Design a protein around this ligand. Structure first.
Ligand code: MG
Ligand code: MG
Lengths: 317, 323
């Protein structure tokens, strides 16, 4: 809603003041002034889907009578901590020392925000541990992604659906889907590991569709102009292409996948069309939607079905 | 450090590797975990481990003798390895900025929080220790940013080379994680939470940290390469060195123009011109006076140490740096 978006965006200026203009580090004003610009440039622009998802999750997990402006604001601050992590990850991926240090500094700042607003609450240690664990798992995901590339060349023998599913889970789904919902759960004082486990099984399945759709639209979407083929990325399209390819089609992937020449991108796009990847994606979208929806209906305990259907409608519709 | 202290500390390392890579977790991604074990083994346990062993020595000299069990000294060792994980992440990053990727650097640092949760999450010192690592991380980042702001394009900004800025760089970039972190970890593991005690320690440790870096800066230009086993490149790299800061303080207009023209140039001739100016400006004699004056100030601050802190810990740390 407009009200949700506006109240969330209104928190950002207070976070910048907390990190750069709170009377700390008085001997190095040039660094804190510059850090405020780094935050202002890199963190609050474009869509804040992960941050707003944290507030939505909290609103639908908490007891209606506990949903106070103060508590919704705490959910918003957790949302901004997720956006500080998102900004650190985006900046690094765009860069790939002053630039690199800025990404580490943005990520490090979220723990200062957690200490200021949550150190006095029971959810403090669970939330800190969640951020630590998600950071470790994200690093493992980036490492698996990099093990699909040798020199500047994609290793197509590594492009298996099993490896693809693991990359998406660790590199993307944990911090994009699990982190917002688990933060909402902890702020609502839901600590039952079985509740977090059940949420995870669903959110990892939604996360996999989210990235497969992103991969499909990289090549077949209507105008950014997608560069997955050029960059030799382990994309769902490349994985399914290798499954469906005859030896002659496999040779085309080996020769042209991950080449910089615009003709090589066109050759791969044409092969994807020849292999019927658009039709294969259409079938996956319908079947995955139906399968996840069945799994949400089987969700027991005090987990609201409503939250997972809302997340689905955002991604699928 | 004693033979027993060193051997007991080194015995912990293979456990931390198994804890992080071979304890039944991340069952679906064995290629990544097997690789990460090699990243830890190849980068973390090699060389001197001064910061890690300093954490152990700090704990042993701060804790009540009756509480110094093998189990507690082993927890001090695990905290020391958490400092060495941080140190390995910073050293890998320095080497990449001059096989391993940037992501490995992030992964090695992230792993220390997994070790902290495993071994300390049950103790009252847990949140203080986590918050100390978070704060030292943020301050180290600020130090690295301040250091980077002394360079514009590929050239040093000599107007930025002030003693005030140099002192702030050494404090935030180096002294907090190298000197404060080991001692504050030792204090927290000994259930010493008094901010006055942490601040008393900090006053001394930041003074030791400043001499540590000033001596390192001096030896970069004036050290014996065959003795130190490294050829110094601070002049070529245009680093905000104590030598450069003091040179600019002592320089007449003609001497300053030599720094403007030749400081941070790749040509070996330019390194010799700057070294000759450092000799002309009496930087060796200035360093000798500083070493004597700083030793005496630090020795007195340690003699004066209060808040029930042990003077012998800080004398041991000082003695190691001044030799
Ligand atoms: Mg994409
Ligand atoms: Mg040096």
């Amino acid at each position: 809603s407009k009200e949700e978006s506006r109240e969330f965006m209104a928190i950002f200026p207070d976070i910048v003041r907390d990190l750069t203009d709170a009377g700390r580090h008085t001997d190095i004003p040039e660094v804190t002034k510059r850090f405020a610009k780094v935050l202002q440039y890199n963190v609050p622009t474009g869509k804040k889907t992960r941050g707003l998802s944290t507030v939505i999750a909290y609103k639908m997990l908490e007891k209606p009578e506990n949903l106070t402006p103060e508590n919704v604001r705490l959910a918003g601050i957790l949302g901004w901590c997720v956006e500080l992590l998102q900004a650190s990850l985006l900046i690094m991926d765009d860069l790939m020392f002053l630039a690199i240090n800025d990404c580490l500094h943005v990520e490090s700042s979220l723990y200062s925000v957690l200490r200021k607003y949550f150190s006095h609450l029971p959810c403090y240690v669970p939330i800190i541990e969640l951020f630590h664990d998600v950071n470790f798992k994200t690093n493992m995901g980036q490492s698996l992604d990099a093990l699909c590339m040798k020199d500047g060349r994609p290793i197509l023998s590594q492009f298996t659906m099993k490896r693809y599913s693991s990359i998406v889970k660790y590199k993307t789904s944990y911090y994009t889907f699990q982190l917002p919902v688990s933060l909402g759960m902890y702020l609502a004082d839901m600590y039952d590991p079985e509740q977090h486990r059940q949420a995870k099984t669903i959110l990892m399945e939604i996360g996999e569709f989210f990235q497969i759709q992103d991969d499909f639209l990289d090549a077949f979407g209507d105008s950014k102009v997608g560069t997955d083929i050029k960059e030799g990325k382990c994309s769902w399209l490349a994985v399914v292409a290798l499954q469906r390819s005859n030896p002659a089609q496999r040779q085309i992937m080996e020769e042209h996948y991950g080449r910089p020449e615009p003709e090589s991108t066109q050759i791969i796009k044409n092969l994807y069309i020849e292999l019927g990847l658009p039709a294969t994606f259409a079938v996956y979208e319908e079947e995955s939607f139906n399968i996840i929806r069945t799994h949400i209906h089987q969700i027991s305990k005090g987990l609201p079905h409503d939250l997972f259907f809302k997340i689905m409608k955002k991604i699928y519709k």
